[PDB]
Amino acid sequence: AVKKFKPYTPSRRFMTVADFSEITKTEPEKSLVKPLKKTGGRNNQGRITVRFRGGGHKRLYRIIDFKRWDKVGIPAKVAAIEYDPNRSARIALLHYVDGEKRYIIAPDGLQVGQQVVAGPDAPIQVGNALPLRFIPVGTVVHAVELEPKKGAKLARAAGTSAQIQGREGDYVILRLPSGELRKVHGECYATVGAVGNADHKNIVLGKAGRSRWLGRRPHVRGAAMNPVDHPHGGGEGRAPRGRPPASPWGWQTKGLKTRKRRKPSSRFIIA
């Protein structure tokens, strides 16, 4: 589900590109309340917070709906499968019989014109969103509210899924793409299905621009820096990480459970 090329150049011997055998012939985003303005790659003091970021391309945001609890009992029709450059998945422009138009992450096996509805009484066909106290066990499900009525904050990149392992009181057991089993409320809205574009990990960027075209600048490595900048200030030659593998600010990056320990959320997890 990718498009390799022929080696008329270097780079484009191995580069692969994604599947558009499912995007609705389209290009234009219905410039309603959807497209917004953009920004850049540091902070509010002008000091690079996350390093090795910038450049890239002009992108336009697409207002995605994660709060699928404001259109309960008001069905909707999937209209179109669109590209979004701000997420690994694609998006879906879907039409509501109300006359409204909105956006949802694109799940698997999602067809066009296919009824899709939010609500506790909605069916299990992929696309529909509802609380988890209602979604049965062993169900592929994505876009989860961690806490009720905050928005989908779990499982929403390409190909990601999540099962349902069983109910416990007003709380539900969830398996995330990581591998944690977390207590989440049962009244947290999640949509059913597995996110689309499960082939994103299979792509190949082939060259160096495709790094730069995606904002991700080139990543210099510590063994080349000077001990003013990095611990591993590889002085003479490719001398080694003179113990022990670490980060520009000093903390080792080899197996340091950096997660907080005296944290309330730890009560709700089983790693």
Partner RNA sequence: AAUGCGCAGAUACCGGGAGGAACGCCGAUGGCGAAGGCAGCCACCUGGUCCACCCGUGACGCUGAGGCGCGAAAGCGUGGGGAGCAAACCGGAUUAGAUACCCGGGUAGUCCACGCCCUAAACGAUGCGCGCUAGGUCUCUGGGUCUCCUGGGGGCCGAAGCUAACGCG
Partner RNA sequence: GGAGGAAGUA
Q: Does 259 bind RNA (CB under 7 A)?
A: no
Name the residues that contact Mg ion, by CB under 5 A: 10-11, 42, 48-50, 207, 211-212, 216-219, 221
Map residues 159-178 to x or -, x wherever contact with RNA holds by CB under 7 A: ----x-xx------------
Structure tokens at 94: 């879907």
Buried b (16+ CB within 10 A) or exposed e, 90-101: bbbbbbbeeeee
Residue 117, phi-psi category: left (phi > 0), alpha (psi -120 to 50), beta (remainder): beta
165 contact choice in RNA, Mg ion, none (CB below 5 to 8 Å, kind-dependent): RNA
175 neighbors 181 (Cβ within 8 angstroms): yes
CB of 159 to Mg ion, least distance (A): 23
What string of DSSP letters covers 149-216?
Answer: TS-EEES-STT---EEEEEETTEEEEE-SSS-EEEEESS-EEEES-BS-TTGGG-B--SSHHHHTTSB
11 contact choice in Mg ion, RNA, none (CB below 5 to 8 Å, kind-dependent): Mg ion
211 contact choice in Mg ion, RNA, none (CB below 5 to 8 Å, kind-dependent): Mg ion
Q: Does 48 bind RNA (CB under 7 A)?
A: no
Question: Could you say which residues in the range 186-225 bind RNA, by CB under 7 A?
Answer: 201-202
30 contact choice in RNA, Mg ion, none (CB below 5 to 8 Å, kind-dependent): none
Binding site for RNA (CB under 7 A): 137-138, 163, 165-166, 201-202
